[PDB]
Curated annotation (Swiss-Prot):
Keywords: Late protein, Viral baseplate protein, Viral tail protein, Virion. This is Baseplate protein X. It comes from Escherichia phage P2. Its main location: virion. Induction: Expressed in the late phase of the viral replicative cycle. The keyword Oxidoreductase does not apply.
Length: 71
């Protein structure tokens, strides 16, 4: 279960949008998504980050981001 990160949609936000907290979770996503701890600042729109310890199906949110052809 990974989603494309965007402006104001980094782990700091996602973690709160899915789990609703950063304490204890930021460490998890770090192990599942290595090298992301080097970025620091906001992530580049399109970052593929996986959400560990997450159930199937989408999450409570509103958005219709559709895109399959980028090349």
């Amino acid at each position: 279960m990974k989603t494309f990160a965007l402006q104001g949609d980094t782990l700091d936000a996602i973690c709160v949008r899915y789990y609703g907290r950063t304490e204890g979770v930021v460490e998890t996503v770090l192990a599942a998504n290595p090298g992301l701890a080097e970025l620091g600042a906001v992530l580049p729109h399109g970052t593929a980050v996986e959400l560990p310890d997450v159930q199937t199906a989408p999450v409570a949110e509103t958005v219709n981001l559709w895109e399959v052809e980028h090349h």
